[PDB]
Amino acid sequence: STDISTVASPLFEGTEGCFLLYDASTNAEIAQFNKAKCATQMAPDSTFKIALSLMAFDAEIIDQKTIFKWDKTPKGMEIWNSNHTPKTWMQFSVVWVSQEITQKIGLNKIKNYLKDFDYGNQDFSGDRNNGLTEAWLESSLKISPEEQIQFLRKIINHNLPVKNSAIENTIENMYLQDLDNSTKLYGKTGAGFTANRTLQNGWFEGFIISKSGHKYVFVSALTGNLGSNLTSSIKAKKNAITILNTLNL
Ligand SMILES: *C(=O)[C@@H]([C@@H]1N=C(C(=O)O)[C@H](S[C@@H]2CN[C@H](CNS(N)(=O)=O)C2)[C@@H]1C)[C@@H](C)O
């Protein structure tokens, strides 16, 4: 386990940040920054779409071809104001799609999947009575970076009781770009403000796959006072990419 504080500290300055990079298959910790913050559960926010995507594909309520029909009313981010696909749901963090999906899957099945996924505190209660559509959004559901790492491992290792295609479709939909050395970056951002505080939580997590197909999981996460502009995930992602490019995996 390489302590990457020298590289990661400056990137997370002004926040309580952390970074974990694990070998997917072996669970070898490859790089870590701030294990204390890594153990701290916080709301997954949009990174919950990783889990939801698995559920939605597994429950067969979506296919890659599914078009989520926008209700034609403003959703809060312009990119959300359009029809979406499971891919763009992920890419653009289209929460209304998530909310359609959770309503379709239903709380019972979500709870079952949370068990299957060993997903953090598995608390989907939300709140009123809004768990089904809000529980992952700076609400009841919490998961730590370390737990996210293990969840991610389970996904890419196909160590989840879901359809293989659910896993692969979800991973595919998380594809973002190649890193500098052509390592594949799959990831998902999440951001939110801490309940009752001005603090922001940010995540960027996912998978990297080397040119030779070697799989790693990583989580970049932070909580910090970043002001009124919700940029925590932007920072988490930029930091993850900086770190990942430095690690040259
Ligand atoms: C998920 O965590 C939430 C949504 N997911 C986001 C993402 O890109 O992953 C975003 S964070 C994005 C970055 N800066 C934007 C600021 N909001 S603004 N002023 O442009 O309206 C937001 C978003 C929070 C969740 C709501 O699904």
Enumerate residues 6+ apart whose C-beta is below 8 A from 229.
Answer: none
| 12: containing domain | 1-249
Going along the chain, which residue ranges are E strands? 2-3, 15-23, 29-33, 175-178, 184-193, 200-209, 215-224
Told to judge if 125 belongs to the known catalytic residues of this protein, a careful annotator would answer no
Ligand 1 contact via 230 beta carbon (within 6 Å): yes
98-to-51, 61, 68, 142, 199 alpha-carbon distances in Å: 10, 12, 10, 17, 24
* 163 has binding-site annotation: no
Q: What is the CA radius of gyration of the chain?
A: 17
How many structural domains compose the chain?
1
Enumerate residues 6+ apart whose C-beta is below 8 A from 22.
Answer: 28, 29, 30, 149, 153, 216, 217, 218
Resolution (A): 1.4
Ligand 1 contact via 95 beta carbon (within 6 Å): yes
What atom of ligand 1 comes closest to residue 137's alpha carbon? 25
Say how far apart CA 244 and CA 22 lie, in whole Å. 12
* 93 has binding-site annotation: yes
**Start-to-end CA span in the chain (Å):** 14
Say how far apart CA 80 and CA 99 lie, in whole Å. 13
* Amino acid type, 169: N
SS3 label, residue 113: helix
174-to-26, 88, 104, 108, 132 alpha-carbon distances in Å: 22, 9, 22, 26, 23
> Which technique was the structure solved with, according to the deposited record?
X-ray
The DSSP annotation for 150-188 comes to: HHHHHHHTT-SSS-HHHHHHHHHHTEEEE-TTS-EEEEE
**CA of 189 relative to ligand 1 center, distance in Å:** 9
CATH number at residue 23: 3.40.710.10
Q: What is the dihedral of CA 115, 119, 125, 130, to 10 degrees?
A: -120
Question: Which residue, judged by its Cα, is nearest atom 17 of ligand 1?
Answer: 230
113-to-99, 103, 108, 141 alpha-carbon distances in Å: 16, 14, 9, 13
Dig out the tokens for 115 from the structure: 């068990």
